[PDB]
Design a protein around this motif. Structure first.
Motif, short mmCIF file in Angstrom:
data_model
loop_
_atom_site.label_atom_id
_atom_site.label_comp_id
_atom_site.label_asym_id
_atom_site.label_seq_id
_atom_site.Cartn_x
_atom_site.Cartn_y
_atom_site.Cartn_z
N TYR A 10 100.48 1.15 31.23
CA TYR A 10 100.02 -0.01 30.05
C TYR A 10 99.30 -1.23 30.58
CZ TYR A 10 104.35 2.79 29.00
OH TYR A 10 105.18 3.70 28.94
N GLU A 11 98.27 -1.58 29.92
CA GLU A 11 97.50 -2.76 30.43
C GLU A 11 98.16 -3.96 30.50
OE1 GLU A 11 94.17 -2.31 27.84
OE2 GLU A 11 92.99 -1.45 29.45
N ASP A 12 99.27 -4.27 29.85
CA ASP A 12 99.99 -5.74 29.58
C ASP A 12 101.40 -5.39 30.01
OD1 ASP A 12 97.54 -5.76 28.34
OD2 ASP A 12 98.46 -6.40 26.45
N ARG A 13 102.00 -6.22 30.52
CA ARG A 13 103.29 -6.21 30.75
C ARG A 13 104.41 -5.83 29.54
NH1 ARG A 13 105.25 -11.30 33.83
NH2 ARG A 13 104.58 -12.37 32.05
N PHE A 15 105.33 -2.96 28.53
CA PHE A 15 104.64 -1.73 27.81
C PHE A 15 103.90 -2.36 26.67
CE2 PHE A 15 109.17 -1.69 29.10
CZ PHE A 15 108.92 -0.89 30.19
N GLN A 16 103.03 -3.25 26.67
CA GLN A 16 102.35 -3.79 25.78
C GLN A 16 100.71 -3.58 25.91
OE1 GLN A 16 102.99 -7.76 24.45
NE2 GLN A 16 105.28 -7.69 24.12
N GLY A 17 100.00 -3.77 24.91
CA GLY A 17 98.51 -3.43 25.42
C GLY A 17 98.05 -1.99 25.13
N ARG A 18 96.89 -1.71 25.49
CA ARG A 18 96.49 -0.11 25.45
C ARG A 18 97.27 0.72 26.42
NH1 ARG A 18 92.60 0.27 23.65
NH2 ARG A 18 91.45 -1.57 24.42
N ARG A 19 97.69 1.90 26.03
CA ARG A 19 98.50 2.76 26.77
C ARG A 19 97.90 4.04 27.11
NH1 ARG A 19 103.84 5.91 24.82
NH2 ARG A 19 102.29 7.01 23.83
N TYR A 20 98.20 4.56 28.25
CA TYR A 20 97.75 6.06 28.52
C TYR A 20 98.42 6.96 29.28
CZ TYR A 20 93.89 9.37 29.01
OH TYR A 20 93.03 10.28 29.08
N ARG A 30 89.48 4.96 36.05
CA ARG A 30 88.81 3.71 35.59
C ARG A 30 88.25 3.64 34.45
NH1 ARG A 30 85.03 2.16 40.22
NH2 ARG A 30 84.04 4.28 39.87
N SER A 31 87.66 4.90 33.79
CA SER A 31 86.97 4.94 32.38
C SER A 31 88.10 4.99 31.04
CB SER A 31 86.45 6.51 32.29
OG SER A 31 85.51 6.66 33.84
N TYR A 32 89.45 5.26 31.45
CA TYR A 32 90.24 5.22 30.52
C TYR A 32 91.09 3.97 30.61
CZ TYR A 32 89.03 9.86 29.68
OH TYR A 32 88.35 11.26 29.38
N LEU A 33 91.17 3.29 31.91
CA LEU A 33 92.08 1.95 32.00
C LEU A 33 91.27 1.15 33.01
CD1 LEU A 33 95.71 3.35 31.84
CD2 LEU A 33 94.41 1.82 30.24
#
Length: 177
Positions: A10-13, A15-20, A30-33
């Motif tokens: 998750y991009e944020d702490r 489990f918030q933000g964009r997830r992969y 790097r292309s997905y996150l």
């Protein structure tokens, strides 16, 4: 069907933000996150690297939930590649270590983890060793701290054969489900 291990970044702490979600090794994420500050491991054990091509700092993550990077002891939120670690079972894991390179010098055999090699064997460095199990982890500083090296099941005749630039190794542990 497609049964397998799975890890979510998750991009944020919290489990918030964009997830992969990933179900296999990835040499360049790097292309997905653009960054990862928290991770969730649903199944399997994975190795993560700070830079692409499995290079830079490496960390092993067993199944579990990490709501923040510090929970994974991450040095920062940079992760460029990840690979699934396969565990091998079978019976009793045994390791043999030699004081000199090319399996020469005094040899010591043990079936248990070692927190401090110098306290146990009175050795300051390790230049050769024969492990036959599957996946073993070596650490540069005592108590399983510092940079870690993952050993497989091949024949290592020189310390550089383990991907290390120096024969310095102070502790090691077996990986088990």
């Amino acid at each position: 069907s497609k049964t397998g291990g799975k890890i979510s970044f998750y991009e944020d702490r919290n489990f918030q933000g964009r997830r992969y979600d990933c179900d296999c090794d990835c040499a360049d994420f790097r292309s997905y996150l653009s960054r990862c500050n928290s991770i969730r491991v649903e199944g399997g054990t994975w190795a993560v690297y700070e830079r692409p091509n499995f290079s830079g700092h490496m960390y092993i993550l067993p199944q579990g939930e990490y709501p923040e990077y510090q929970r994974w002891m991450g040095l920062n939120d940079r992760l460029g590649s990840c690979r699934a670690v396969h565990l091998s079972s079978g019976g009793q894991a045994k390791i043999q270590v030699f004081e000199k390179g090319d399996f020469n010098g005094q040899m010591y055999e043990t079936t248990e983890d070692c927190p401090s090699i110098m306290e146990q064997f009175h050795l300051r460095e390790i230049h050769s060793c024969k492990v036959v199990e599957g996946t073993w982890i070596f650490y540069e500083l005592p108590n399983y701290r510092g940079r870690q090296y993952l050993l497989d099941k091949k024949e290592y005749r020189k310390p550089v054969d383990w991907g290390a630039a120096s024969p310095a190794i102070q502790s090691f542990r077996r990986i088990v489900e």
